[PDB]
Amino acid sequence: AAVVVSSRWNPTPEQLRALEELYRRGTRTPSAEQIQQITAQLRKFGKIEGKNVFYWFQNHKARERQKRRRQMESAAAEFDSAIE
Amino acid sequence: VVSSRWNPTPEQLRALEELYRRGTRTPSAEQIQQITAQLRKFGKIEGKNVFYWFQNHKARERQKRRRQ
DNA sequence: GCAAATTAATGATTTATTCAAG
DNA sequence: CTTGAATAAATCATTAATTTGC
* In chain A, domain spans: 4-71
Question: Whole-angstrom Cα distance, residue A37 to residue A76?
Answer: 41
Q: Is A74 on the interface with B (CB under 8 A)?
A: yes
Q: How far apart are CA B53 and CA B4, in angstroms?
A: 16
Gap from B1 CA to chain A (nearest CA, Å): 25
Number of neighbours of residue B50 by Cβ within 10 angstroms: 28
C-alpha torsion A65→A83→B15→B64, nearest 10: 50
- Nearest nucleotide (C1') to alpha carbon of B1: D15
Q: How far is the CA of B52 from the C1' of C9 (A)?
A: 15
Closest among A39, A35, A36 to A15, alpha carbons compared:
A39
Query: Of the candidates A71, A75, A78, which has its C-beta nearest B51's C-beta?
Result: A78
**Widest pairwise Cα distance in chain B:** 43
Neighbouring C-beta atoms of residue B66, cutoff 10 Å: 7
Do residues A77 and B29 make contact, with C-beta atoms less than 8 angstroms apart? yes
Indicate the resolution in Å. Answer: 2.1
Residue B27, min C-alpha distance to chain A (Å): 7
Closest CA to B32 of B7, A66, B40, A41: B40
Q: How distant, in Å, are the alpha carbons of A34, A66, B62 from that of A12? A: 20, 24, 17
Following DSSP, what letter does each residue of A1-48 receive, concatenated? ------SS----HHHHHHHHHHHHTT--S--HHHHHHHHHHHTTTS--
